Every structure is written in C-alpha cells, then in structure tokens.
RNA sequence: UCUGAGAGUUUGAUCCUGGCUCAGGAUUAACGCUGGCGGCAUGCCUAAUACAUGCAAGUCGAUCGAAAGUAGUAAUACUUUAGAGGCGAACGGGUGAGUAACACGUAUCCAAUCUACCUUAUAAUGGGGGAUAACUAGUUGAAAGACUAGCUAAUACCGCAUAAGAACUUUGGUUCGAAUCAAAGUUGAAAGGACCUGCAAGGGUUCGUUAUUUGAUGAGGGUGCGCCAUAUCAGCUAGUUGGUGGGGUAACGGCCUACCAAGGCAAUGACGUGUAGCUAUGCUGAGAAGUAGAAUAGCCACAAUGGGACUGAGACACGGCCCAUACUCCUACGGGAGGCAGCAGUAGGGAAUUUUUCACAAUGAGCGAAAGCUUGAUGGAGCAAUGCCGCGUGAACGAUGAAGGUCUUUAAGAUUGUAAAGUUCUUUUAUUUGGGAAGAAUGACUUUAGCAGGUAAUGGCUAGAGUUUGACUGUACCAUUUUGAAUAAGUGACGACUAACUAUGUGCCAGCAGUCGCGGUAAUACAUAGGUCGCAAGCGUUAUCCGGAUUUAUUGGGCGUAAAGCAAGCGCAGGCGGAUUGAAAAGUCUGGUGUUAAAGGCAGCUGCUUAACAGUUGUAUGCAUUGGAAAC
RNA sequence: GGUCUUGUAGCUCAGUCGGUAGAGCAACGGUCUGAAGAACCGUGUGUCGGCAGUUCGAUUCUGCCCGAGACCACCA
C-alpha cells in the first residue's frame, strides 16, 4: 500500500502468479532466507493453489474439507 | 439553520445603529471637555454617560474609570 | 439518566445545565434508581437548606422528593 | 468446550473413576489400554510435573464436566476473597448447584443434572434455574419441580440415592438443603490442591 | 425522502417491436402526450428519456429503459425495445419483462429481417395475442401498399403460429396525433381499446416467495446502491432479506427501500416494475441482467433436460445443423448463459427443427422451473427453442 | 500486614559472560477456518477527504398591533400567526489538525477580577415625545432583494422629573497597600400582560418591572511544581528589559502607545529541532515503573481556509454575519447561493470498524401562567461471534466390543469403543397457546380536605379521589400452552522445546520452519490419511505493548583475561565531609485540618435466573496549613 | 449492454492473402563424470481461448460466445 518494494517468500504449495497479481500478506521470519520476514495469505485472492490443504487452512485459507 | 437566525439578523441592526449613534453623542461631550474645562461640562458628560453606562453600550466599570480620570484631571485645575 | 442499559437508573445530583449529563457533578445528593419503585432514593437532607436558600435551581426531581417530605411548610418561615 | 462427549475416553488416559471403581470396570474386562492403539509400553513421553498438572486439571475439570471459561472466572473471583484460597475454592468448587444435585442422591450423573437444570426441572428457593453455576451458601432450599416428577430416572435415583454427609434431603418431600460446611476427609485424598493452584501461571 | 407515491392506478407492462425511423421516439412521446389528457399523470419523454452521448446525438437506444404513463383507469410502463442488430439481447430482456406491446410497423419503414426475428422471439417466448399498430399513414397514405404492409404483418404473425388473420392492426400515425390532429389522436384510442383485450392484467400475488429480473443497476447520491428491474412474482416490503443467485455465490442482503423509477413505492408484488436500494451491496457485485431469489425457494440449476425445437431456416433459423460441442447461449429472462448442446446418444449433428428431448449443462447455475418457455441463440441468430422438462440438479 | 515460574542456545564437551528466541497476558483489532442463542459494553484510527436529504433551536399570542380562518345576522368568541418584542441563543454534539505551554492538573494569589437568570433584603411600579415594523402601492433581477412614497402596536426606542439606597467628586474622622463612617456636590428608576374584588372611586391577585443587597454560579488571570526526545541544538530577546506618562480589559498588567535609557533570558540548558490534545485512566509487574494516553470522563482548542465586526451575560460562534481565498452548485452568464469535526448515509482510503431506524414513554433542557412545543442530547430498536459472559448442540442404560478406518505390516485380537444399533426418557432453546408485570410512589389537570400572612374576594402551599402520556412490550416470565433429539462443532497441534503416534508417498524436489532442525534415498519434523491431544461458539495467526528480561540495575550490575578505569597529573563549579557545645527546625518523622471531582483501585452488601456491569458505604496517595523532635 | 485490444505448447513468441504448428527455457533419456558440476544434444511438449458459416482440414475470411482489459450505463 506504501511505495515500498519488498521481497517475500511464496508460501503454500503450487503457484498461481500472474505478474502483478494482488496478494494478501503475512509476516514471518524464515531462517532459510536471509532477513526475509514476510509471507502471503495464499488461498483468499486471485492466486488459488494450496491443493488438499487439509491439515491447517486457518493459514492458507480454503474451503473446509468435505468429510 | 437555526430558526432565530434571519429574524435576529434583521433585528440586531437597530440595536447596533442605536449603540453607534449614542456612543458619539457622548464622544462629542468628551471632546468639548477637551476643548474647555469647567464643572458644567463635567456634569453634562456624566449625565450623558449614565445612559450608556447603565446598559452594555459603554462598559460600566470602564465608565467608572473614565469618569474618575476626568474628575481627577479636573481637580488638578 | 445514568445507569446500565435496560436498567433505568438516575442518581440524584445537583447539577447545572451548563454541564452536560455524565460530565462533572457539583454535588451528588445521594442516589436514585427507578429499578424499584417503592423506596430507592437517598439524600444528605442538609444540602437542601442553603442549596435552596442561594437559588441555583437543581434538577427538577428534587421538588417531587420534597413532596414526599413536605419541605415547604417547614421552610417558608425561614425563607421569609 | 461445553460438554465432555465420550466419558471413559478420559477415564482411560487419566486413570479416572468417579464411582471410584466402576468408571473403568465391568465391561467385559477392566482394561488399562490408553486411548488409541499406541499402548505398547509407555511410562513417560513428556509426562512430568507440568504434564501431571495438566492431567489433574483435566481430571477435576471433567469430573464435573465444566468449561475452562467458568473455571478461570471462578478462580479469579476467589482471588477477591481471603483465607486459604485452595480449600475455600474446593468447597465452592463442590458448592454449586449441579454437584449438590448429584450428591443429593438425585442425579445418576452430573451430566444428567446439567440436562435437568437445562430442562428447567430444578427449583431453588422458589427461583427457576436456567444455569447451574450458582455458588450456594448455608440456608438454601432445593426442591424437585413436582410437575416433572413423571421422569422414571429421577424416581429411581431419589429412593436409593447417595446423600453426601454435608447436604441433607428428604425423599418424602423430595426437598433438601446445604446444611453445613464440609470437611476434606469426605473427598478423596488422591487429589491435591497444590497441583492446580501452582499450575496457575496464566493468571 | 424521495416523494413517496400512492400506487392507485393498476399496472400493465407494454412494449414496442420494430425499429427506429418508424418514428419510434415520436410514438413514445405521442402515446404519453395523448393519454395525458384522457388520463392524469402520463409523463412524457421524447429526448428526455435520452441521457447519454450517442443517445443525445444519434438518438438510438443502447441501454434500453422504461417510460411511465398513467390513465384514470390504468397505469402503463412502455419498454423501449431496440432493433439495431447486435442489440437483440436488449430486446429479449424487454420481451422477458413483457405482458403486452404495440408492434411498430410503419407504412414506409415496414418489416425488415430484424423485425422478423423480433416477432419470432416474441412468439417463441410466448406472448398472449400481441396487439399491432400500423404507423406512418400520414405520409404516403396508400390504398394497396398499406394493404401490403398489413398483409405481410399478418403473414409474419401466422408464420410463427399467431392468428394473424385476426390480429388487430390499427392504422394511422402518431406523428399527427402528437402534432394535434384528432383524426390520428383517436387512432391511439382505437389502439388502446384493442389493447384492453388480449393484453392481460398481471396478477399481483402474495403466495409466491419472490422473483426479480434486473434491468439496470443504480446508485444514489448519499444513499447507496439501487438495483432495479421487474418483480415477476412474490410479495416484498422494506427490510426483508433477499439473496443474489447465479454467476455468484448465493449471497444474503437486506433491502433498504422499494421504489419505482427513483421514487419509493407502497409495496412490491408480482408483475411490478420496481427497484430497491439495498444494504451493504456493491454496484459491481450486482450486474445488469441477473436473477434474484430469497432463501427457501427454487434452486439454481446448471444442467437439465428439456424438449427443444430448433429454428428452421424456413421460418428464420439456422441454415445448417448444430454439433454436440456446439456452444450456443441460453436465456433465462436476464442473461445469455452459454451451454453446450449435449445432444442424446447417437445424435451429434442435428439439423434445425426436429423437436427432440436433449440435455444441456450451463456454465452458471440458473434457477429453472418446469413449464418455463425460453429461447436459444448464438452467432447473432436464434438457433434453438424449447421449454424445461426435467431438472437433474 | 505484603508479594516472585521457566526454558533452550556459542563448543569437541565443559565453566563463565552474553545476546537472541520461546512458553504468557492485552488490542476501535482485521484477516484465515468455522459459527445456535441471550445478557452485557464498545463500535471508522486511514483522507481533521468532499459530502442530496431530513433532523441536530426552538419557544412564548395570558408581550404586542395586525393578518387569515371558523361558530355567531351581528356583537364578538375562539384557533394559529405574516411580523415585531422577549427568552435561550455561548447549552449541547463531534473531531484532537494544531499547540512542548501556566495546556493538563496540583496546591494557591486574586489588596486585581466580574458574574444574564436564579437567593436574601430595601425602595416603587410617573408623565410625555417620536415611531416604524406589519402593511399598502411599484420597479427591477431567476432569486439573492433593494430602493420611491404613505400608514398604524407593544413591556420596541428615547427626553423630563422625582430619585431612599447606590456610584462618582469635595471635606472630615477612622484601622492596618486596602477599608468603614459623617456632610454636601455631580449623575443615574421602571412596565406593562391577564385578572379578582369592586355601581363606580379605588384596593388588590398574579408574572414581571427598576435602583438595589445578599449569595452562589461560572469565567478569567497569575504563582510553585509535574509531565516529551533532543547541546552532531551557545548564544538569544530591540517592546525584548527597566523607568515615566497616556490609551485599552470584568479586574491589574509594554496588553498597547510615545519618550528616557540597556537591560532580560540560558551551560544547574535561552533556545534550535522532531513529535504531541494533557490528565483520570487501560494492559503487564510483587513494586516503583514500562505501555497506550482505546471507551468514557475533567478541562482545553477549532469549526472549509484567514482575518474582521454586530448583538448579547458572555460568540466573532459546527448548523449567526461581512470581506478575501479555494471548492461546489445555480444562473437570465451579468450575479447569487453551501459549509454533517450534528446523527445516521454515500463516494475515496484502509483489511475493515453499526441504520439514510422508533419514541421524546423515561432523564434532561429551555420556551412558556398554563396548555403545549421541539429536542441526531437522551432512552431505545437493529448490524458486527467487536469483547466478555451465560447457554445448547441430548440423559441414563446399552458387551468382551455390531459393521467398519487402522494396526499388529493378513489370517488372532486390539483401537476407534459405550463408540454403535437399540430400551425408553426428555425440552432452557426451538414450536403452537393464553396471560402478564413494573418502569408513570414522575409531572402537571380538575375539583375535595386543611394551612398562612389578607380580606370583602382571591390567588400561594400541603394531603387524599380519578384520568393519564410505555418507546421498549408481543419485554422478562409462566401454566404438559401443541409438538419435538429434534434447532446447532469446529479449530489447531502431536520431535525437543511447550501435553498430544502410526501408515503411505516423497527423496534437501516439493515444502514446513521462533530455535535446533526435517526431505541429495526407509522424514517422529514434510504432504495426506487414521488414531491421539488441546481450546471451543469460537480456534488459530497477524501487528503493537508488557511480562518473562533483575537484560542501562531505587527495588535490580560491573569496569584484570567476555563491552566497561580514562595515559597521568594539576585541579574550578560541584558531590562527598573529623569530634564535642548551643540555637532554630528548613529538610525528615509525626497528629489534626482543607483539597487531590467522580468513575475507576480495594472490602462488604445489592440488582444483576450466576457473573460481566452498575449502585451502597467506608476506602488511600501527593500538596498546603497547624501541634509536637532534634535522631540526623 | 454496446465502441475496441487480447487468450498460439507447460510459459513466453514465429508462422504468404486458406497448401505448414515450430525456436528459447520448464522438463524426460543418452554423451557424462573417481563421485559431482559443466556438457553436446534427441524427444514428448499444439486443429492456435471455445463455437457458427465459406471452401482447399479456417488463428489465417468473417461472425458469435466465455474471461481479462483502455470508454459510456441515478449521475445536473
């Protein structure tokens, strides 16, 4: 929303990037990336991968697994 | 819009004009006192000022201060 | 009034109209709660005397409370 | 959670028995296998002092089958009173409505007492109860709500019901009272207040 | 507030069939001007209906709309249905909102293939005994060419199954009626008496839950989002809950207020052209041409089976057969929903006509009920025609 | 009397130092998954961005001419008011941009101050003048309106006089910068409306009148202090400093003016500069404190921007006025019109923060004899799992355990699992039925009974009789009021941290990850599945603060080899000071007094079907004053 | 709803006015190497967003549709 340009990790399985898509973000330090402490809420926007996210879709939001 | 806006706008002009006119009817007496000093003009100034000092047209405490000033400077002569 | 929602309460106060309700109270004359309409009012019974003797009409509910006590026929002689 | 659901699924893990023998026994064979097939040979995975504090929390909490919000709230309320907070709390923890109804000889289970209080079939001091979370004090009357006497379960329970030594009832009128303040010996000594009270680091 | 009406003049929906240069704008002005005298409050617009560039200047209708005009006995709403090929859907929605109408066929600018297809679709959806008016009898007042226009109008009506030999075609020209000549003003009276029969009164009912066909989407200054259309069935009032259905997840919303043409109304019932300011909705979320419903009503269906008679070229249809992977567009009174013609087994290449039982799946779930008569179009022309027989989903 | 949680991690391991991380609470919280209900409190922080509409201020005709209307042939009577006059208009509502200061307070000086109304008390409620509003006639412009000439009311406005008492002068006396008193001088007060009693004359009722006297009320100023970061911010202030005079403020004041001079501020921080509504308070803590100064409250600032003036008790006034500016709109293109930081509502923003709702029933306000009036204040209703709370989603029984998911890597048996089918049993909610409160021991209304000055009437006051105005209410609630398990469980984790294992696949690929860490070939870790576990109508994570962290240490540190003793000396200001004698008691302890509102802290109690919340009382702290001690 | 751009492989692009679907990389196998990188390469990878006409199988000549996207749709 500000003019800043920040690098982040692509969370969740799969990819639905469209080169200037809209992404709903999240923090989160990860030590495999030097100084990266940002992520995305993968699952509620134009990017919809996260196939069978059936253990935790509180993160990476998706429809409740039909039982 | 308050209902009593246009009505009071039309009304208060008379009060303003009356106050403005009555102030100078005392200012002329004060200037006459400047021109020549005597007890008669002091009495005339007090008589004309007691009208406006009664109301809010001339501040009553300010009127007291000014009348004290006038009677004090007259006592000098 | 001032109190819990759906719990009508109006504490008795000698407040001036220049001060809004829930603002600063000048002198809270005990309290009142219309949640029980048999007896729920209390006052100091001493403020009434010269807090009436020096004017400054408080909240209008003091008159009806005075009716429960008949304060006029014992105060008119002091008044004049 | 508001309920417990399965009952001996907690008796298996906690070594729990409210009937003091029959909450794990006489169902073909009293078995000590923990919930799940993973009961080969266990002594401690992370079982420790904190783990047994959690266990005792889940035991005392679920031997009344209540929620954590109510339990934390009542502990916070007891923090406002003085004296030995542990014993006063345990007496209060034993002094609400549903535990009393269970101990009057009237409820087959505290779950049944909760259901009957929910169903509006319990009357306390001429005040109909919709929530069993009242904290009772000496000098209270608990009756049967006679219009609901048609229940056979309450009939069966009331006659041969176990009456606790500190609250007393009459089945000729189906009415009872909290007579006195109980003593510790009436309750099992396996429980210790220390576990739960020192377990309190959240509040 | 926005000048609450008191609905006391009963409503009948009326429309137009044909093309511009028939005097269409002049006819729309003339009907209202004439009926204003014999009936109070018949508001008129000639260029005041026009509100946008190329509708100011060119004068054609691109975003079709309605005109209100009332009499001392009845109220009427006239739908400005267009010709102007590639605007055919804009006419379909008019025919989707339609109980009665005036077939505009002038003695000079007579029926063209566009009007042929217009009458084809009007018959195909099902219109009760449509009323016809013969226009432009002032200029080029003919004796046999007028007979020609009438005879081919009746023939075109009969080609679709109408009783064209008995369809009333009132002669005259509303241009001179608006100009001030009673000789042509009385012809509008003759037309409206011919309208009194064969153009029925819709039954405003309470038993049906609800149904709304969207005509446009509207936003007010300082108030919110208004969705307007026609209430096909169902009773309504202010404060009720309505669901958006089709092309979107079924989403619940609260109505803020019921109006008709920018001013609030008494109560919405079946067959009422109205609108509604809604609570917490977006003009983007709602779309022009969407179906509405309330919870506990008819389910939206993607795939269903019906009996469809395709459009023969002999009557103005396809000149070649259609495939199974063929992708025409269906119409449920609001939208051009696309669905492949999943013809039954052994049938993949099916020629026009030949009423046959076929099943089709749609790209969007639309509420379908049996007995509902609709059309099928693709490529700019009508390719299929039938009514729902069974719902499978 | 009063309160105390830990853990891993440097390396080969270890001891020491040490950061980091986590386990925990709180949020205008949104978001993610999911979601029955009620009580309860709050609900746009962003763009102090613009914003149709309504309403946010109207009321008084018993203050007035006059207008219109109706009952009346009239006489008139009555209703409202086009308008004048009066009252309130400055209460209130909401946004903290701004201001780092007498702003917020605190304790105080106001011998430096006023104070519409309202209280106490004293004197009367005179005679005149001039009118115009309103209106009539007309032009012009779209209106904004103005002007040309007439016509009448008031308690509208203004002379004259009486003016006790006042105020200002002169003079006299009077006590500790003030003030009372004796005399005179100057000058100043109004009003009528309705009405009883009257043949009338008049007396008078009642609202008010003026000069008055008492108050309080509020306002304002000032003092000592306290509360940001900041000297890689040392000179700054020319009305600034002091003095004289004058002008202006409710009061005094370089507040200002002209003159005479050069002083004033600051190294113990003038000021430079970034940010800021302050406080009570809310979270954490055992504490001081850190946190934010949510929501409300006290106070203060402003009202599109910048000035300015009227009136009024006070305003330059959110919704009054002029000008200029910017926007917007209308336009006859010449000129006019508007200020939701008033409520809701919309557009832009954000991830988002309730309805363009009902009643003025109740509180409260004023305007009014009264009637009655409005009241985006207020009470409500509705939206949001916004937060907490209450509460269901069935009870018991049911066996070596139905099928079946899995396993032991199959055939047992176990787990799921009393889980199940099933025996009945049932309803807070749900569902039909009728009843049903209180809130209105409000206020006035009318008569009745009684009291008082006053009598010849009244009027004023007190008790009872009735009418009442209920928004919510159909509320809460209940009688098998009819039926009914029916109306309802997800979420995350299971390697150690920090409670929660098996199978498959996968092979440092996918990805999980605060830590170590897992998958380059049998992953406790990753993806999924079964089982287990934990919180639950919510669960988790996000982001901020706090705890843990006693980890800049008053509580609560060291300066040898982990940061830290200056390279040393001289040494100003300054800090720290031998013993004995005396004084005061400044500081200090301490008792009493006033204040630090209230809410909120605490304890009891009460309504809260139980708690949330609200109310009852008591309930500290700091400052000032006063009585004690010399221990220091 | 229309004024118009656009969807060619797994991705990006080339493809006489109808004769024909391919490059670069993602990426499978060989050469490969003590093992690993590097490595030269052969693939597979499409009726061209989906449908209706025309004829010489139509991206190719057009039209229609689905979706995204530069204008107009209370709107003085």
CSV table of C-alpha atoms (C1' of nucleotides) in Angstrom, one decimal, chain F residues 234-454:
chain,number,residue,atom,x,y,z
F,234,A,C1',25.5,28.8,22.6
F,235,G,C1',24.2,32.5,22.3
F,236,C,C1',19.3,34.5,22.1
F,237,U,C1',15.4,38.7,23.0
F,238,A,C1',15.1,45.9,20.2
F,239,G,C1',8.5,46.3,23.2
F,240,U,C1',12.7,42.4,24.1
F,241,U,C1',14.4,44.8,29.6
F,242,G,C1',13.7,48.6,33.1
F,243,G,C1',11.6,53.6,34.1
F,244,U,C1',7.8,57.9,33.1
F,245,G,C1',3.3,59.2,31.2
F,246,G,C1',-1.0,58.0,28.4
F,247,G,C1',-4.7,54.8,25.8
F,248,G,C1',-7.5,49.9,26.2
F,249,U,C1',-9.5,44.9,29.6
F,250,A,C1',-14.7,42.4,34.4
F,251,A,C1',-10.2,43.3,37.0
F,252,C,C1',-4.1,44.7,37.1
F,253,G,C1',-0.6,44.2,33.5
F,254,G,C1',4.6,47.0,27.3
F,255,C,C1',-1.9,44.4,26.9
F,256,C,C1',-0.6,48.6,23.7
F,257,U,C1',1.4,53.9,22.8
F,258,A,C1',5.4,57.9,22.8
F,259,C,C1',9.5,59.2,25.5
F,260,C,C1',14.3,58.2,28.7
F,261,A,C1',17.8,54.6,28.9
F,262,A,C1',20.3,48.7,28.1
F,263,G,C1',18.8,45.7,30.1
F,264,G,C1',16.3,40.5,30.4
F,265,C,C1',16.8,35.2,29.2
F,266,A,C1',20.5,30.4,29.4
F,267,A,C1',25.8,25.8,30.5
F,268,U,C1',22.3,23.6,37.1
F,269,G,C1',20.1,24.4,29.2
F,270,A,C1',17.7,30.8,26.5
F,271,C,C1',16.7,28.3,22.6
F,272,G,C1',17.5,25.3,17.9
F,273,U,C1',14.7,21.0,16.1
F,274,G,C1',11.2,16.2,15.5
F,275,U,C1',6.5,14.8,17.8
F,276,A,C1',2.3,15.6,20.8
F,277,G,C1',-4.5,17.1,22.8
F,278,C,C1',-2.9,16.7,28.7
F,279,U,C1',-5.0,14.1,32.8
F,280,A,C1',-8.1,10.3,35.4
F,281,U,C1',-7.0,6.3,33.3
F,282,G,C1',-6.5,0.5,30.3
F,283,C,C1',-2.7,-3.8,29.9
F,284,U,C1',1.8,-6.1,32.5
F,285,G,C1',4.5,-6.3,37.1
F,286,A,C1',5.3,-8.1,43.6
F,287,G,C1',6.8,-3.0,43.3
F,288,A,C1',8.5,1.6,41.5
F,289,A,C1',7.5,1.8,37.0
F,290,G,C1',7.2,0.4,31.2
F,291,U,C1',3.0,0.6,28.0
F,292,A,C1',-1.1,3.4,25.2
F,293,G,C1',-2.6,8.2,26.8
F,294,A,C1',-8.6,2.8,23.5
F,295,A,C1',-14.1,3.9,25.7
F,296,U,C1',-15.8,7.3,28.7
F,297,A,C1',-14.9,11.3,31.8
F,298,G,C1',-12.5,16.7,33.6
F,299,C,C1',-10.5,20.7,31.0
F,300,C,C1',-8.9,23.0,26.7
F,301,A,C1',-8.5,24.2,21.1
F,302,C,C1',-11.2,24.8,16.4
F,303,A,C1',-15.3,24.7,13.1
F,304,A,C1',-13.8,24.7,4.7
F,305,U,C1',-9.1,28.4,4.9
F,306,G,C1',-7.5,33.7,7.0
F,307,G,C1',-9.0,37.9,9.1
F,308,G,C1',-12.7,41.2,10.9
F,309,A,C1',-17.1,43.4,13.1
F,310,C,C1',-22.7,43.2,15.3
F,311,U,C1',-25.8,41.7,19.2
F,312,G,C1',-25.9,39.5,23.7
F,313,A,C1',-24.2,37.9,30.4
F,314,G,C1',-20.6,36.2,27.6
F,315,A,C1',-19.7,34.5,20.3
F,316,C,C1',-16.5,36.6,16.2
F,317,A,C1',-19.8,31.5,17.3
F,318,C,C1',-20.2,23.3,13.7
F,319,G,C1',-25.7,24.3,11.7
F,320,G,C1',-25.2,33.7,13.1
F,321,C,C1',-22.8,38.0,9.7
F,322,C,C1',-19.1,40.9,6.1
F,323,C,C1',-14.8,40.5,3.3
F,324,A,C1',-11.0,37.8,0.7
F,325,U,C1',-9.5,32.8,-0.6
F,326,A,C1',-10.4,27.6,-2.5
F,327,C,C1',-14.1,24.0,-3.7
F,328,U,C1',-19.1,23.0,-5.3
F,329,C,C1',-23.8,24.4,-7.3
F,330,C,C1',-27.4,27.6,-9.8
F,331,U,C1',-27.6,31.2,-13.3
F,332,A,C1',-31.1,35.1,-17.2
F,333,C,C1',-23.6,34.4,-17.6
F,334,G,C1',-24.4,39.9,-15.7
F,335,G,C1',-24.5,37.8,-10.4
F,336,G,C1',-26.0,34.9,-6.4
F,337,A,C1',-26.2,30.5,-3.1
F,338,G,C1',-23.5,25.9,0.9
F,339,G,C1',-20.3,24.6,4.9
F,340,C,C1',-22.6,16.6,8.8
F,341,A,C1',-15.1,17.6,13.2
F,342,G,C1',-24.9,17.2,14.3
F,343,C,C1',-26.7,11.9,13.8
F,344,A,C1',-27.3,8.4,10.8
F,345,G,C1',-26.0,7.7,4.9
F,346,U,C1',-22.9,7.9,0.5
F,347,A,C1',-18.2,8.4,-2.6
F,348,G,C1',-12.2,7.7,-1.9
F,349,G,C1',-9.0,5.2,1.7
F,350,G,C1',-8.0,1.0,4.7
F,351,A,C1',-8.2,-5.4,5.8
F,352,A,C1',-12.4,-3.2,8.0
F,353,U,C1',-14.9,-0.6,12.1
F,354,U,C1',-23.2,-0.3,13.2
F,355,U,C1',-29.1,2.1,10.4
F,356,U,C1',-30.2,7.0,5.2
F,357,U,C1',-34.3,3.1,12.3
F,358,C,C1',-38.7,4.0,16.8
F,359,A,C1',-40.2,7.3,20.8
F,360,C,C1',-39.5,12.2,23.0
F,361,A,C1',-42.8,6.6,27.4
F,362,A,C1',-38.5,7.9,30.9
F,363,U,C1',-33.8,11.6,32.2
F,364,G,C1',-32.5,16.4,30.8
F,365,A,C1',-33.0,21.2,28.5
F,366,G,C1',-35.2,25.6,27.8
F,367,C,C1',-39.5,28.5,25.9
F,368,G,C1',-43.8,29.3,28.3
F,369,A,C1',-49.2,31.4,34.0
F,370,A,C1',-50.6,27.2,31.8
F,371,A,C1',-51.7,24.5,27.9
F,372,G,C1',-48.4,22.9,24.7
F,373,C,C1',-43.8,22.8,21.9
F,374,U,C1',-39.2,20.9,19.8
F,375,U,C1',-35.1,18.5,21.4
F,376,G,C1',-29.4,13.2,15.8
F,377,A,C1',-29.0,15.3,23.8
F,378,U,C1',-31.4,11.0,25.7
F,379,G,C1',-33.8,6.3,26.1
F,380,G,C1',-34.3,2.7,22.5
F,381,A,C1',-34.5,-0.9,18.4
F,382,G,C1',-31.2,-3.1,14.6
F,383,C,C1',-25.7,-4.6,12.5
F,384,A,C1',-20.9,-6.8,14.0
F,385,A,C1',-19.2,-14.3,17.5
F,386,U,C1',-16.5,-6.3,18.3
F,387,G,C1',-15.0,-8.1,23.5
F,388,C,C1',-16.6,-10.9,27.9
F,389,C,C1',-20.2,-13.8,30.0
F,390,G,C1',-24.3,-17.3,30.3
F,391,C,C1',-26.1,-21.1,27.4
F,392,G,C1',-27.1,-25.9,23.8
F,393,U,C1',-25.6,-29.0,20.0
F,394,G,C1',-29.3,-34.8,24.0
F,395,A,C1',-29.8,-38.4,29.7
F,396,A,C1',-29.2,-43.0,31.7
F,397,C,C1',-28.8,-47.8,30.2
F,398,G,C1',-26.8,-50.4,26.4
F,399,A,C1',-20.7,-56.2,25.7
F,400,U,C1',-15.8,-58.9,25.8
F,401,G,C1',-16.7,-54.8,21.8
F,402,A,C1',-22.4,-54.6,15.6
F,403,A,C1',-20.3,-53.2,10.6
F,404,G,C1',-16.4,-50.6,9.6
F,405,G,C1',-11.0,-46.8,9.5
F,406,U,C1',-6.5,-48.6,11.1
F,407,C,C1',-2.9,-51.7,13.2
F,408,U,C1',-0.1,-55.9,14.6
F,409,U,C1',2.7,-54.6,8.2
F,410,U,C1',-3.3,-60.5,6.9
F,411,A,C1',-5.2,-65.0,8.9
F,412,A,C1',-5.8,-63.6,16.1
F,413,G,C1',-7.2,-59.6,18.6
F,414,A,C1',-6.9,-54.6,19.7
F,415,U,C1',-8.1,-49.3,19.0
F,416,U,C1',-11.8,-46.4,17.4
F,417,G,C1',-15.2,-48.1,21.5
F,418,U,C1',-20.4,-47.4,25.5
F,419,A,C1',-18.1,-45.7,20.2
F,420,A,C1',-22.8,-48.3,18.0
F,421,A,C1',-27.7,-50.3,16.7
F,422,G,C1',-31.1,-50.1,20.1
F,423,U,C1',-34.8,-49.6,25.6
F,424,U,C1',-37.3,-45.9,26.9
F,425,C,C1',-36.8,-40.6,28.9
F,426,U,C1',-36.8,-35.5,27.7
F,427,U,C1',-37.0,-29.9,26.3
F,428,U,C1',-33.6,-23.9,28.6
F,429,U,C1',-33.7,-23.0,23.4
F,430,A,C1',-36.9,-24.4,19.4
F,431,U,C1',-42.7,-24.9,18.5
F,432,U,C1',-48.3,-23.7,18.8
F,433,U,C1',-51.4,-21.1,23.1
F,434,G,C1',-53.1,-17.5,26.5
F,435,G,C1',-51.8,-14.5,30.3
F,436,G,C1',-48.6,-10.9,32.0
F,437,A,C1',-45.9,-7.0,35.2
F,438,A,C1',-43.2,-2.7,37.0
F,439,G,C1',-40.8,1.2,34.7
F,440,A,C1',-45.7,6.7,35.2
F,441,A,C1',-45.0,6.1,44.9
F,442,U,C1',-42.8,11.3,37.5
F,443,G,C1',-45.0,16.0,36.1
F,444,A,C1',-48.8,18.9,35.6
F,445,C,C1',-55.3,18.5,35.1
F,446,U,C1',-59.6,19.1,37.7
F,447,U,C1',-62.3,19.5,41.5
F,448,U,C1',-62.2,17.8,47.7
F,449,A,C1',-59.9,18.4,53.0
F,450,G,C1',-56.8,21.6,55.6
F,451,C,C1',-52.8,26.0,56.5
F,452,A,C1',-51.0,31.1,56.2
F,453,G,C1',-49.7,36.4,56.4
F,454,G,C1',-55.1,39.4,53.6
